[PDB]
Amino acid sequence: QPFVHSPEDRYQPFALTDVQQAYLVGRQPGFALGGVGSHFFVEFEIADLDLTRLETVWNRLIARHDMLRAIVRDGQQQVLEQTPPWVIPAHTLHTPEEALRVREKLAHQVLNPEVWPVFDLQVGYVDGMPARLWLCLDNLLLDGLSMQILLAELEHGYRYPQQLLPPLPVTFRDYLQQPSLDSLAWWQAQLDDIPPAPALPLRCLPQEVETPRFARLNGALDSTRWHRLKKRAADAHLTPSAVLLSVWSTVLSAWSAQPEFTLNLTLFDRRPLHPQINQILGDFTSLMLLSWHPGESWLHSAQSLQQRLSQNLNHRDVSAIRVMRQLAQRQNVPAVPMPVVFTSALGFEQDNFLARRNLLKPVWGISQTPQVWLDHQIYESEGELRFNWDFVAALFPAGQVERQFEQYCALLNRMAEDESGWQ
Ligand code: NA
């Protein structure tokens, strides 16, 4: 079907996605966590920052991407035609300690989605040190792939400020309006075979965390080992995502009260309704449950997970949001939460995202998701697999997440080197 553009309605309100609605209500106390926002925060270091150049690039991106000018208003989303140019606030800091105090303030700020802008961008000059760029974007409006697109454009524009990009020919607003946007029956069919989320040890009731604060652990698998592990995956009839999911679930099983459990998978692939759809910013998130049922050998367990994954992917028009409701109705409980999440940006041609030699050098970051305890996020860059776990640190016993991360990194590396554990 041909894409239907409605430029005369470009600035009219439009409906929020299911994911966006969940984020907004996740600002309030819920079944699995206190209220929290949904933003993504990164600190970059820039040698010899040219503020005027950065401001030009950023304002071009605001003009280029409708969803940077979006707000939530009267229960819907809306793109603002004209917004005041962003004049970047700059702080003068005399020590790295002073800059850390600013980072801490900005990384945990609350973006009000009702008042433009639903982002923040400030800089900090530190005497005799690289300047800092503190960037805050909201997953309420820009999904993970959108944030990779936008950050790559920000790097590219700052490096090559003379290049002008032609306007985008398709909008997120119009995408959501397309017609294309028994799967429900297929999901209802196996409500009895979806086990609860991982029953991980907690140091308190998660509902009793009034102001959840996220922390991050990050790692990488070097490009030689990641190539080798992808090859071994192929030889064992597993996608790379299935291998990573199975390695992670092995660690989670070892800590959980029950060895079988369900994860919520966050995916970003877009329906191919316009040839340039992968170039725009918006919320294209899909959520999909996937259960881990360990068997005799890791390999058998991974192969069962891959088969389940392949089938489930065929039914993502029914969201995990809906399935969790069906699960709670079937089980006669108020809610069935899925607070342990796996988020994959593999496969989206964002090669060399955050490439080592980037002028905007990422040095620190954190992300929040309401009603989530632990989010394992992955992406590929410069041939390496890069990953981070974002988690509510206060929920878990001291040292627990750090130890699980240590075990996960060790197992990942060993399985990339050592053929033994592939049965
Ligand atoms: Na977020």
Residue numbers in the entry: 1483 to 1663, 1669 to 1910
Quote the original article.
Nonribosomal peptide synthetase heterocyclization (Cy) domains generate biologically important oxazoline/thiazoline groups found in natural products, including pharmaceuticals and virulence factors such as some siderophores. Cy domains catalyze consecutive condensation and cyclodehydration reactions, although the mechanism is unknown. To better understand Cy domain catalysis, here we report the crystal structure of the second Cy domain (Cy2) of yersiniabactin synthetase from the causative agent of the plague, Yersinia pestis. The second dataset was solved to 2.35 Å resolution using the 1.94 Å resolution HMWP2-Cy2 model. These structures demonstrate the pseudodimeric fold characteristic of the condensation domain superfamily, which is a two-lobed arrangement of two chloramphenicol acetyltransferase–like folds.
Here, we report the 1.94 Å resolution crystal structure of the Cy2 domain of Ybt synthetase (HMWP2-Cy2), which with its acceptor PCP (HMWP2–PCP2) forms the NRPS half of the NRPS–PKS interface. Two X-ray datasets were obtained for two crystals of HMWP2-Cy2. The first dataset was solved to 1.94 Å resolution by molecular replacement using the structure of the Cy domain from epothilone biosynthesis (EpoB-Cy; 35% sequence identity) as a search model. HMWP2-Cy2 crystallizes in the space group P41212 with one molecule in the asymmetric unit. Electron density maps obtained using the 1.94 Å resolution data permitted building residues Q1483–L1663 of the N-terminal subdomain and N1669–Q1910 of the C-terminal subdomain (HMWP2 numbering) but did not support building the hinge linker between the N- and C-terminal subdomains. The conformation of HMWP2-Cy2 defines an open and continuous tunnel, with a solvent-accessible surface volume of ∼543 Å3. The putative catalytic dyad residues (D1862 and T1830) and helper residue (Q1864) are found in conformations resembling EpoB-Cy and BmdB-Cy2 (45). Intriguingly, the HMWP2-Cy2 active site contains an unexpected metal-binding site against β1 and the latch strand. This metal site involves three backbone carbonyl groups (S1520, H1521, and Q1855), a carboxamide (N1621 following the first aspartate of the DXXXXD motif), and two crystallographic waters, giving rise to a distorted octahedral coordination geometry.
